[PDB]
GROMACS .gro file of N, CA, C and O in nm:
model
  520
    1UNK      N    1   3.684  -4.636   1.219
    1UNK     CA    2   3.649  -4.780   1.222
    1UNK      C    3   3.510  -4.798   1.282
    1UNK      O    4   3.432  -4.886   1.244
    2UNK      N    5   3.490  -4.731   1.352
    2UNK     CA    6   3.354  -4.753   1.424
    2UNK      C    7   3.314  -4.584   1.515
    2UNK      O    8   3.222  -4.505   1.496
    3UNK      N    9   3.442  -4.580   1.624
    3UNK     CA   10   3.465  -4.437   1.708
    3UNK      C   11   3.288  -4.395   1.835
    3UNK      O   12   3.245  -4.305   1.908
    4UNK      N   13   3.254  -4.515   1.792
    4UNK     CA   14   3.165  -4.524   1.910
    4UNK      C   15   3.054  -4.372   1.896
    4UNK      O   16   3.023  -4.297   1.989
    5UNK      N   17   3.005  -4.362   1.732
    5UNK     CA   18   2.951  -4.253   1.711
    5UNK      C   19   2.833  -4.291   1.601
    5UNK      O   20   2.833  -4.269   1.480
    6UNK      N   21   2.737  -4.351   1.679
    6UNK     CA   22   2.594  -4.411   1.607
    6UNK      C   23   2.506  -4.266   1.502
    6UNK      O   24   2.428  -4.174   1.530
    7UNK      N   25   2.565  -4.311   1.393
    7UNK     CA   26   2.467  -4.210   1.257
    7UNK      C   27   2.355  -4.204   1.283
    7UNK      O   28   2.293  -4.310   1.288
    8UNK      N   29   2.291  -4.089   1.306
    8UNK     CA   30   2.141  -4.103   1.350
    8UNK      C   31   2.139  -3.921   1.365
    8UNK      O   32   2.216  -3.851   1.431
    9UNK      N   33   2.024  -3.877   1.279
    9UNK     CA   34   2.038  -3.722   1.246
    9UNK      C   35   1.878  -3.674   1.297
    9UNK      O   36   1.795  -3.639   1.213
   10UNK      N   37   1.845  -3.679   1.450
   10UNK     CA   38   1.729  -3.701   1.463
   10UNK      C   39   1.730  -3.533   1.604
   10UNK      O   40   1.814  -3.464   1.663
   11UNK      N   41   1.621  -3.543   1.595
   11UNK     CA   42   1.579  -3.412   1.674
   11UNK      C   43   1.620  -3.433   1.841
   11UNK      O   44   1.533  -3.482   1.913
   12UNK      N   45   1.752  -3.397   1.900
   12UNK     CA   46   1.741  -3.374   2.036
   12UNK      C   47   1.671  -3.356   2.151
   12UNK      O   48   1.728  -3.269   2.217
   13UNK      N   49   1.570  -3.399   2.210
   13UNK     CA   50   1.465  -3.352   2.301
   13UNK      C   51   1.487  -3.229   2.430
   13UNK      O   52   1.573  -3.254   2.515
   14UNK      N   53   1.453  -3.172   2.435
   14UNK     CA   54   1.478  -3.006   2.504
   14UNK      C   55   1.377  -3.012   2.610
   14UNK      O   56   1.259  -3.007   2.574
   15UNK      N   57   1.406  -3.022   2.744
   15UNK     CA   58   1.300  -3.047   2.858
   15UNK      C   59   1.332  -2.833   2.924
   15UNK      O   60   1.425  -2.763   2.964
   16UNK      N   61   1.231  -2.825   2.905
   16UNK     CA   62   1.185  -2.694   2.924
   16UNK      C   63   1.177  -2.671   3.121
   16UNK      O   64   1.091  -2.709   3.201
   17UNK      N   65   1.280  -2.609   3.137
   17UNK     CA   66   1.226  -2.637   3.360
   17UNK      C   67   1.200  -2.530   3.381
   17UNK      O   68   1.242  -2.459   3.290
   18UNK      N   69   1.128  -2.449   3.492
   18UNK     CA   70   1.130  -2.367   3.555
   18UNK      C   71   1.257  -2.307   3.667
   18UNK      O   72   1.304  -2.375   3.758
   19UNK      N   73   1.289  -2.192   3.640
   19UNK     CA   74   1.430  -2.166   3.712
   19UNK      C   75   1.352  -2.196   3.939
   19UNK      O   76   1.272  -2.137   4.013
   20UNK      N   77   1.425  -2.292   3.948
   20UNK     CA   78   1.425  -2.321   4.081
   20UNK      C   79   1.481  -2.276   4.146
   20UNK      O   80   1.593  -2.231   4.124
   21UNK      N   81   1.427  -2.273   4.241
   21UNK     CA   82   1.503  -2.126   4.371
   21UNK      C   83   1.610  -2.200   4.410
   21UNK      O   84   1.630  -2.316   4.445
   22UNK      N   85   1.693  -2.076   4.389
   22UNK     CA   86   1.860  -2.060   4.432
   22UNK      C   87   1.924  -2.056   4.542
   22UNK      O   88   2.045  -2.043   4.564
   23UNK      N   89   1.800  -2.076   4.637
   23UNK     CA   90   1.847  -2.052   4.824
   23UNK      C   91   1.736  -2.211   4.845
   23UNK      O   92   1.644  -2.225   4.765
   24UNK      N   93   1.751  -2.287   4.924
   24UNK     CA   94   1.683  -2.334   4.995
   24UNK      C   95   1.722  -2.392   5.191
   24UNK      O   96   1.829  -2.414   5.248
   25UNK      N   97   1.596  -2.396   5.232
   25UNK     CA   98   1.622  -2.432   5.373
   25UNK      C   99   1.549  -2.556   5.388
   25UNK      O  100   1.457  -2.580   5.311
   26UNK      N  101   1.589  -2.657   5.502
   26UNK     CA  102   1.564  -2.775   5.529
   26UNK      C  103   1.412  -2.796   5.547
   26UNK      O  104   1.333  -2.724   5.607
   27UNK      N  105   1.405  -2.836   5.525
   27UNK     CA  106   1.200  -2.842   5.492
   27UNK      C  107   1.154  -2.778   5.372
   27UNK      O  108   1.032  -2.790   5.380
   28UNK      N  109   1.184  -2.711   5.255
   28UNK     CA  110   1.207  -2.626   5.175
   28UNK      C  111   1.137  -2.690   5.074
   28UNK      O  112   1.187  -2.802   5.079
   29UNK      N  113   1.045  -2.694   4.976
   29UNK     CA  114   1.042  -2.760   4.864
   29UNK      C  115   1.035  -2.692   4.761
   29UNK      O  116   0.961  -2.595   4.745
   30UNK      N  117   1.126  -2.745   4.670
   30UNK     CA  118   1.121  -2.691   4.533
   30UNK      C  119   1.008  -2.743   4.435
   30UNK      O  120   1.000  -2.866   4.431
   31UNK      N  121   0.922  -2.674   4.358
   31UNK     CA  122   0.864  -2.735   4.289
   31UNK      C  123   0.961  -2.678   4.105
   31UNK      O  124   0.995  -2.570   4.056
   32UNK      N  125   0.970  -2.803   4.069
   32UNK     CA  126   1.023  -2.819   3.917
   32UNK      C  127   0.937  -2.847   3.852
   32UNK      O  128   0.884  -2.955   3.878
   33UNK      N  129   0.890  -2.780   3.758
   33UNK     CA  130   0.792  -2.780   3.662
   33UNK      C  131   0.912  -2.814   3.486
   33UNK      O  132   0.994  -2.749   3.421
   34UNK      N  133   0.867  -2.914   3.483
   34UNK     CA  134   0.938  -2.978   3.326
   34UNK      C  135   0.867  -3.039   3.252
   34UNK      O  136   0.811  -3.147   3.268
   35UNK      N  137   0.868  -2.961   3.158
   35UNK     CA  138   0.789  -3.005   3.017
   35UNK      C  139   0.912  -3.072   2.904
   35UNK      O  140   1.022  -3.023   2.880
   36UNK      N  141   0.870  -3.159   2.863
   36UNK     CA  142   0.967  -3.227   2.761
   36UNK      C  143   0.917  -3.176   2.593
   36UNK      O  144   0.810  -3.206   2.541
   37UNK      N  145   0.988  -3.122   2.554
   37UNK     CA  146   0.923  -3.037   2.403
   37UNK      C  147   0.990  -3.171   2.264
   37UNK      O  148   1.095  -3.152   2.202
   38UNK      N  149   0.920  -3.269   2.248
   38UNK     CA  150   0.922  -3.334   2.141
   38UNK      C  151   0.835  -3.367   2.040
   38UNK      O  152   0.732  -3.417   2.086
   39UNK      N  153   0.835  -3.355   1.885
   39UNK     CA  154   0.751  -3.339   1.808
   39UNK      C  155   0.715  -3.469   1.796
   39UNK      O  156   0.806  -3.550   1.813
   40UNK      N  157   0.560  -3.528   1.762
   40UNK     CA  158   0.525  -3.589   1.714
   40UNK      C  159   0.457  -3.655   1.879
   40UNK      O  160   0.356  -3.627   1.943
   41UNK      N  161   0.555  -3.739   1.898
   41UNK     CA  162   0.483  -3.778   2.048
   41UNK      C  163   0.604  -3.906   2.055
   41UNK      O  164   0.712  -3.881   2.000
   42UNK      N  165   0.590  -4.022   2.113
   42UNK     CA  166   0.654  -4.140   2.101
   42UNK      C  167   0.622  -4.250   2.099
   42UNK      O  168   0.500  -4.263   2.109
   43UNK      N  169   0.710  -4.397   2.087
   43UNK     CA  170   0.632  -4.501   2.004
   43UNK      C  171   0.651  -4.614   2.116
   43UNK      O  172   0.736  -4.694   2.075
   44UNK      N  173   0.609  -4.644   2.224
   44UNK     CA  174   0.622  -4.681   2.364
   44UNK      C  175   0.785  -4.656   2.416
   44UNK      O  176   0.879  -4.727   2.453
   45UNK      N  177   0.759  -4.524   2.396
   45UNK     CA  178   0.887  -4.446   2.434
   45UNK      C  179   0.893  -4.365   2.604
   45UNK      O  180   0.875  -4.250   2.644
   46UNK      N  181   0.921  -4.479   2.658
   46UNK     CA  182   0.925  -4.419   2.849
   46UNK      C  183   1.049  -4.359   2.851
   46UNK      O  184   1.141  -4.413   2.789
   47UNK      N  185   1.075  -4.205   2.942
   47UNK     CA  186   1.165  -4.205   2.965
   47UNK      C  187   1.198  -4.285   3.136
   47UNK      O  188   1.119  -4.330   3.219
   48UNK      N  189   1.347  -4.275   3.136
   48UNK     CA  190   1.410  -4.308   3.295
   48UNK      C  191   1.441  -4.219   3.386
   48UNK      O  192   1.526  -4.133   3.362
   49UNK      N  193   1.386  -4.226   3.490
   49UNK     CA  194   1.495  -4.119   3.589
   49UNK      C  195   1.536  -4.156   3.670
   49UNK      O  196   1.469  -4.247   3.720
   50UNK      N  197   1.658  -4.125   3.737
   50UNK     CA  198   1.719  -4.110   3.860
   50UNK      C  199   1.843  -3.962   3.850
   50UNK      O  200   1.862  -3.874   3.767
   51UNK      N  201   1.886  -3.986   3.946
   51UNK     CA  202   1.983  -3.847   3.996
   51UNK      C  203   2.071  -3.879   4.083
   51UNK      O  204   2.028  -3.981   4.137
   52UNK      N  205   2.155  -3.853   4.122
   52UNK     CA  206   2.255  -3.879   4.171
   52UNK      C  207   2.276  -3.697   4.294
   52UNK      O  208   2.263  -3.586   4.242
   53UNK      N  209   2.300  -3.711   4.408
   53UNK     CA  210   2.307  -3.636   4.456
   53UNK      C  211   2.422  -3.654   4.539
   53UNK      O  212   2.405  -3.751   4.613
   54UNK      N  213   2.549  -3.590   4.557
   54UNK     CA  214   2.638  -3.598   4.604
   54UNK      C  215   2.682  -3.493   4.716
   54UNK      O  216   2.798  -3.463   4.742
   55UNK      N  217   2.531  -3.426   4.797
   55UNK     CA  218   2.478  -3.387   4.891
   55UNK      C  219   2.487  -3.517   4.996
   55UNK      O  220   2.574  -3.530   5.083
   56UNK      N  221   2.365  -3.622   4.965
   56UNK     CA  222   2.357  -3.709   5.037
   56UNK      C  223   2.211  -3.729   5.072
   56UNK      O  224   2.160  -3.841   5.069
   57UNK      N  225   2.136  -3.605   5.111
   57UNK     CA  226   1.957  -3.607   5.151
   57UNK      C  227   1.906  -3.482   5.056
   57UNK      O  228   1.965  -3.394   4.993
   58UNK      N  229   1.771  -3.517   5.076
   58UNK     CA  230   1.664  -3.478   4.996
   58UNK      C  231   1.563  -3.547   4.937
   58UNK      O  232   1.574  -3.634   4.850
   59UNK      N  233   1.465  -3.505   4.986
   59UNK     CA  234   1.343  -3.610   4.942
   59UNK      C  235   1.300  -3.517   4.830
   59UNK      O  236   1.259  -3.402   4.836
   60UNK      N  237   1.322  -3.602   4.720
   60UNK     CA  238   1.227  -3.579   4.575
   60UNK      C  239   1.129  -3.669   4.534
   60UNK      O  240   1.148  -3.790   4.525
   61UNK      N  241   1.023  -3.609   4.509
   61UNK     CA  242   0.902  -3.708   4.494
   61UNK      C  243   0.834  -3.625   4.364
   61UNK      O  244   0.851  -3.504   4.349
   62UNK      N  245   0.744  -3.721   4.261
   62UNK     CA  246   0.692  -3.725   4.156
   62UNK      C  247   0.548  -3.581   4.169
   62UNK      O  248   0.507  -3.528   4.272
   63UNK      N  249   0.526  -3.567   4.094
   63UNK     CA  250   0.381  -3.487   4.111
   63UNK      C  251   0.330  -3.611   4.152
   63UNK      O  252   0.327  -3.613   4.275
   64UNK      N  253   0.283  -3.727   4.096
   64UNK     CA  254   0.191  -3.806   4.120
   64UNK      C  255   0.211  -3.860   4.234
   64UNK      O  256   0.142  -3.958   4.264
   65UNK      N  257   0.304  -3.814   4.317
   65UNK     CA  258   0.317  -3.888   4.456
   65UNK      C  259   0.419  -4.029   4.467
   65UNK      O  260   0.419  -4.113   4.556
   66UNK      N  261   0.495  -4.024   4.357
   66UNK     CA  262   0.624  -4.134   4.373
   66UNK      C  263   0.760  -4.060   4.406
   66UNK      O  264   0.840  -3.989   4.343
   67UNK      N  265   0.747  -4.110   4.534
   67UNK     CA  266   0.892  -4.098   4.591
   67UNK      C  267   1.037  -4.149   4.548
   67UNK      O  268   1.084  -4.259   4.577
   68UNK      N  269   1.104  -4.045   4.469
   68UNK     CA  270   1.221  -4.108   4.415
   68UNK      C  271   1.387  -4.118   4.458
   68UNK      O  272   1.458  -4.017   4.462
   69UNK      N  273   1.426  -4.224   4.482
   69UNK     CA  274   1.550  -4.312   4.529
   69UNK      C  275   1.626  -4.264   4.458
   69UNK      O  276   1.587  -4.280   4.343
   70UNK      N  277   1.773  -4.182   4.464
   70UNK     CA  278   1.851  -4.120   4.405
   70UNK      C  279   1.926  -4.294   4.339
   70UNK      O  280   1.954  -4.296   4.219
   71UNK      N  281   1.946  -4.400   4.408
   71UNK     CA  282   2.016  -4.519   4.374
   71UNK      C  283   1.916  -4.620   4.284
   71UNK      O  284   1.950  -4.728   4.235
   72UNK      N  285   1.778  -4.552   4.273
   72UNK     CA  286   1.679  -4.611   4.193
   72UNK      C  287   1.667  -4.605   4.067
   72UNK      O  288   1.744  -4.536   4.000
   73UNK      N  289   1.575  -4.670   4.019
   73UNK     CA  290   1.566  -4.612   3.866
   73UNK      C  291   1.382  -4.618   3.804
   73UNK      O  292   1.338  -4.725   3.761
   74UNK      N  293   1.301  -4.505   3.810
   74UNK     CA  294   1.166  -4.471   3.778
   74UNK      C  295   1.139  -4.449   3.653
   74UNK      O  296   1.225  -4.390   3.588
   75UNK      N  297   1.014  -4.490   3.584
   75UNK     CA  298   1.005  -4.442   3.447
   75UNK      C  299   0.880  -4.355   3.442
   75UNK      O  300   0.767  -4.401   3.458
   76UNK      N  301   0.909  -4.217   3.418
   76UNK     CA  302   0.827  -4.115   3.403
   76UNK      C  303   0.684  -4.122   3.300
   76UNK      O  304   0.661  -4.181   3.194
   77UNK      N  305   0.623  -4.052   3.366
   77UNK     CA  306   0.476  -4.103   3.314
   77UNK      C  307   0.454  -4.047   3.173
   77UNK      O  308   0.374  -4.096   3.094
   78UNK      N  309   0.527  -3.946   3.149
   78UNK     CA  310   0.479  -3.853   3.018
   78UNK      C  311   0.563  -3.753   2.996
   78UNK      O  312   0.666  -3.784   3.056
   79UNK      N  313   0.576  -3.663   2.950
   79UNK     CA  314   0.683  -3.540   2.879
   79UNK      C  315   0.595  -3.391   2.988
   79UNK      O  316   0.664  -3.292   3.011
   80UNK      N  317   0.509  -3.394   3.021
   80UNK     CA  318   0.429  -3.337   3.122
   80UNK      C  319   0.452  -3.359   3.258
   80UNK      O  320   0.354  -3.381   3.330
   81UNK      N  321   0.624  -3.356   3.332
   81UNK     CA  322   0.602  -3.406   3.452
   81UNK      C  323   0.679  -3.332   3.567
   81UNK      O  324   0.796  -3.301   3.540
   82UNK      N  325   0.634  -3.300   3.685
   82UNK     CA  326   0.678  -3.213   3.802
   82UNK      C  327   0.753  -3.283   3.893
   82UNK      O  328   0.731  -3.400   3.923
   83UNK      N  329   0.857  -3.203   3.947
   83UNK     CA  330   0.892  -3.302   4.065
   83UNK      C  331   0.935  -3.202   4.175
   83UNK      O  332   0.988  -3.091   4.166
   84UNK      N  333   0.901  -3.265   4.265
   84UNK     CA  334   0.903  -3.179   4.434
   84UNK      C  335   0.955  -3.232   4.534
   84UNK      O  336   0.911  -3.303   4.625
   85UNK      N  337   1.073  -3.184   4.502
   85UNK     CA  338   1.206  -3.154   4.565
   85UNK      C  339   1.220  -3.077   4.706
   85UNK      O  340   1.254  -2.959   4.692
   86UNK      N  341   1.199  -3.122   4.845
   86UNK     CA  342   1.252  -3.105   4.972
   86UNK      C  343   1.376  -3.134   5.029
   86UNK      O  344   1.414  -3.244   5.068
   87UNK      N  345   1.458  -2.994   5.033
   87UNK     CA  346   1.596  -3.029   5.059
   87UNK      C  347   1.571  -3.047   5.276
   87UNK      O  348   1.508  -3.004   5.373
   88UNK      N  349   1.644  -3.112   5.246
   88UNK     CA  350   1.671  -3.167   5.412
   88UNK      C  351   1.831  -3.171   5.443
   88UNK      O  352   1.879  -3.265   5.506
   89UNK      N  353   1.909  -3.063   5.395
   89UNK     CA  354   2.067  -3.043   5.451
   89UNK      C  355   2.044  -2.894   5.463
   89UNK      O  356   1.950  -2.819   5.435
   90UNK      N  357   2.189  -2.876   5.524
   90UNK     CA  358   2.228  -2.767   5.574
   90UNK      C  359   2.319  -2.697   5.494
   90UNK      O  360   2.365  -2.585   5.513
   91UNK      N  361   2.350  -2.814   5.356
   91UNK     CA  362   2.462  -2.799   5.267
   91UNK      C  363   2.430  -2.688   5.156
   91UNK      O  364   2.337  -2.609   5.146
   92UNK      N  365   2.541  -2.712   5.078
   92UNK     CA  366   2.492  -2.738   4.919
   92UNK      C  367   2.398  -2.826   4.860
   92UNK      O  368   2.421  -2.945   4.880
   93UNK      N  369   2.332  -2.807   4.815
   93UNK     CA  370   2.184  -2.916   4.760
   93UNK      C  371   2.252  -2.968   4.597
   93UNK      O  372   2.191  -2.927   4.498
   94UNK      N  373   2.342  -3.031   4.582
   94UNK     CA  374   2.378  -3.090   4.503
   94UNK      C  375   2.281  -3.159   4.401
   94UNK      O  376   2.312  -3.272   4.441
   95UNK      N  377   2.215  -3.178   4.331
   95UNK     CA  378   2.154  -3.303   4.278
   95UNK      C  379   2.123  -3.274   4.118
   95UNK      O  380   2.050  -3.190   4.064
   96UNK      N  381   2.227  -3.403   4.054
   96UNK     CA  382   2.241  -3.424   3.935
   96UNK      C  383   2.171  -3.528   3.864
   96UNK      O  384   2.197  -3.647   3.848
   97UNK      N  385   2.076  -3.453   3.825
   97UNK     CA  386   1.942  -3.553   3.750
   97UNK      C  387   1.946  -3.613   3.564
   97UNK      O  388   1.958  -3.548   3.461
   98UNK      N  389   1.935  -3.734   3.583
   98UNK     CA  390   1.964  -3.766   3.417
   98UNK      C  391   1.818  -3.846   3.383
   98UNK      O  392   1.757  -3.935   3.443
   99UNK      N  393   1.780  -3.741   3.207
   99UNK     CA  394   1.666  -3.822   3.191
   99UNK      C  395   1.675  -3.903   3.108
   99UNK      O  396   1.661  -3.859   2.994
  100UNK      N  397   1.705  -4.065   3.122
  100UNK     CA  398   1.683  -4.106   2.971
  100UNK      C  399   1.647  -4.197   2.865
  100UNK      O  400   1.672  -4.316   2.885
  101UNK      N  401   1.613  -4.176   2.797
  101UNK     CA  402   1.571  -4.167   2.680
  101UNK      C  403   1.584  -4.313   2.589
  101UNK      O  404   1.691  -4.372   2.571
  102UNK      N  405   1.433  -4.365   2.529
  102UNK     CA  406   1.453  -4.499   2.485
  102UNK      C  407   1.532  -4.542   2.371
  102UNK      O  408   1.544  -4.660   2.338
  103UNK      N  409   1.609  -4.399   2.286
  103UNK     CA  410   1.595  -4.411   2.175
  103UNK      C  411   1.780  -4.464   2.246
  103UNK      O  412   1.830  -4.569   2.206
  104UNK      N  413   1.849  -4.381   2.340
  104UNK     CA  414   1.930  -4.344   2.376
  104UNK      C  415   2.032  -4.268   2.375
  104UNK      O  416   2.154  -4.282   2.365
  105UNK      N  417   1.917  -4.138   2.392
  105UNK     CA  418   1.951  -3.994   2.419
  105UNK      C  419   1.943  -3.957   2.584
  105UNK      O  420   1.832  -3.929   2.630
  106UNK      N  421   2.067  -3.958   2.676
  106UNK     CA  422   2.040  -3.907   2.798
  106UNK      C  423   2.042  -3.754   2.800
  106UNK      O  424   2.127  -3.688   2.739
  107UNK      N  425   1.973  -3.716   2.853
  107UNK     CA  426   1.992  -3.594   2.917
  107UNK      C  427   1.987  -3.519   3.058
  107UNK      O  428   1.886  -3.518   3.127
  108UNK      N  429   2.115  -3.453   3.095
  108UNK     CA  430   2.141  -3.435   3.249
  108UNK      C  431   2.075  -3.280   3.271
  108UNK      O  432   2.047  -3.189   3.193
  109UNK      N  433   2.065  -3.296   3.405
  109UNK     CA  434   2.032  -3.135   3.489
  109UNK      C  435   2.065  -3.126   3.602
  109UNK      O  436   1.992  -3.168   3.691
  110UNK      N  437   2.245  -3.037   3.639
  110UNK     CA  438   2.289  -3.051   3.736
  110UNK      C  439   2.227  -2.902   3.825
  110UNK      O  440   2.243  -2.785   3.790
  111UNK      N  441   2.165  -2.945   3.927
  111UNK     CA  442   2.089  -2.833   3.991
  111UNK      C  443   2.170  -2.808   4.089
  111UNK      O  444   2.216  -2.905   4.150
  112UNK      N  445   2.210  -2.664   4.133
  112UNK     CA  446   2.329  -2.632   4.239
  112UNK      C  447   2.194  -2.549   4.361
  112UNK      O  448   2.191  -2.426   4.353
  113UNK      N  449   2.120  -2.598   4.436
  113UNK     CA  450   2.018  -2.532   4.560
  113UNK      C  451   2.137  -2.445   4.632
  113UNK      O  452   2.249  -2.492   4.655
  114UNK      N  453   2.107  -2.345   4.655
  114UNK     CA  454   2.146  -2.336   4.767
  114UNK      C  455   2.305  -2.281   4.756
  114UNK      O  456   2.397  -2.362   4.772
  115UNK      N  457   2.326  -2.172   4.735
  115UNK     CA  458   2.421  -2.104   4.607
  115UNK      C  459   2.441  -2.020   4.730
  115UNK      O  460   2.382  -2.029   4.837
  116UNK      N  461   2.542  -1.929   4.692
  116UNK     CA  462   2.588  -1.805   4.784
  116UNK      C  463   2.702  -1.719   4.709
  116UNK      O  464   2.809  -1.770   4.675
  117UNK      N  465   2.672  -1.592   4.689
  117UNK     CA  466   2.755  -1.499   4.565
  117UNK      C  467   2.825  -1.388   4.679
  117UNK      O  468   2.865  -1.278   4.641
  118UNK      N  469   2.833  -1.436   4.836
  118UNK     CA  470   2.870  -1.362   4.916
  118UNK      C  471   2.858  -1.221   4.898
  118UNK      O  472   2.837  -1.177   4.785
  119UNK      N  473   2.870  -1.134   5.015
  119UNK     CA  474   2.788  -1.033   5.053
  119UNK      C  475   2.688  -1.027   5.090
  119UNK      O  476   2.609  -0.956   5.028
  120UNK      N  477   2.649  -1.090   5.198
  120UNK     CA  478   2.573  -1.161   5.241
  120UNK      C  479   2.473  -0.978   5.275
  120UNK      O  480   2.362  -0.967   5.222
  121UNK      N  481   2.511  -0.893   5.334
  121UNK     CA  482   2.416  -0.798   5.419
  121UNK      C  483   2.495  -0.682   5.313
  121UNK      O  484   2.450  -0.568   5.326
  122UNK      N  485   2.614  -0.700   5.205
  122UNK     CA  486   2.708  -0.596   5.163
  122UNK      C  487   2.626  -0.512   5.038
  122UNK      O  488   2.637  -0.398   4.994
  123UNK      N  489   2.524  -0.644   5.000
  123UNK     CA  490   2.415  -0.637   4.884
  123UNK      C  491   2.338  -0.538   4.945
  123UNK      O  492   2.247  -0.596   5.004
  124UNK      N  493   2.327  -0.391   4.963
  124UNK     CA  494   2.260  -0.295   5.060
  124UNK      C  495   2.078  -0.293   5.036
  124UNK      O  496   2.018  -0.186   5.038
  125UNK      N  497   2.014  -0.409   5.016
  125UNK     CA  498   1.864  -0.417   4.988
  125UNK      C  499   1.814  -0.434   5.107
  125UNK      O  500   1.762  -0.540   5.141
  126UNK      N  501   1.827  -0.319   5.192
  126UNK     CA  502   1.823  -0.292   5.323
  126UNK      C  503   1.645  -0.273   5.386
  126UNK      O  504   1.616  -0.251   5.503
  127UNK      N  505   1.559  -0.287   5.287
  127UNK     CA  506   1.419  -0.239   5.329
  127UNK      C  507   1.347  -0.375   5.322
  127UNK      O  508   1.309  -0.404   5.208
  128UNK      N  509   1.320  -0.467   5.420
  128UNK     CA  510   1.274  -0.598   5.453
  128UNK      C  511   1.121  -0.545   5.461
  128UNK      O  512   1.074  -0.442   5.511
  129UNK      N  513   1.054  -0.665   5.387
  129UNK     CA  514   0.926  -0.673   5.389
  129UNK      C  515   0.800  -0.789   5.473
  129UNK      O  516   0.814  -0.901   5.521
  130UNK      N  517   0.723  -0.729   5.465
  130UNK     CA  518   0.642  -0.874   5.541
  130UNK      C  519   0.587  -0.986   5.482
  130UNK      O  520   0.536  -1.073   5.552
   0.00000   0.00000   0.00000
């Protein structure tokens, strides 16, 4: 009848990130490097961001120096854009980022900081460097 499934046979957008470090400490910043890979370009096509972090802290801020509000909502400058990410817990660094899209295509990136595959000293890479 309808099934809530809009016909539209159009190219998915694929945001390209850099793998972000898997350990972080409180003062820590991640830099995310994301490129958005779409052909042609767009037709006053902003994307949105916010994220949702169910951590609780972490200051993420824009390359260009905009500080972003996990309860906010920012519109990214271009398909060319960084964001630098300072975790400030002791936790898990939770934070589930959605980008989206004017056409209305969201796309999520649930980032897990701060991971642990235990064996902490059992991993025998016993020769520390300076």
């Amino acid at each position: 009848m309808n099934d809530d499934v809009d016909i539209q046979q159009s190219y998915p957008f694929s945001i390209e990130t850099m793998p972000v470090p898997k350990k972080l400490k409180v003062g820590e910043t991640a830099e995310i490097r994301c490129q958005l890979h779409r052909d042609g370009r767009f037709e006053e096509t902003k994307y949105f961001i916010r994220y949702f972090q169910p951590d609780g802290a972490g200051t993420l801020k824009m390359s260009d120096g905009t500080v972003l509000l996990p309860n906010d909502l920012y519109p990214l400058p271009g398909e060319t854009f960084r964001l630098y990410y300072t975790s400030a817990s002791t936790d898990q660094q939770t934070v589930d980022v959605y980008f989206q899209d004017s056409f209305g295509q969201l796309q999520q990136l649930t980032f897990s900081f701060n991971n642990d595959s235990s064996k902490e000293e059992e991993l025998e890479h016993h020769h520390h460097h300076h």
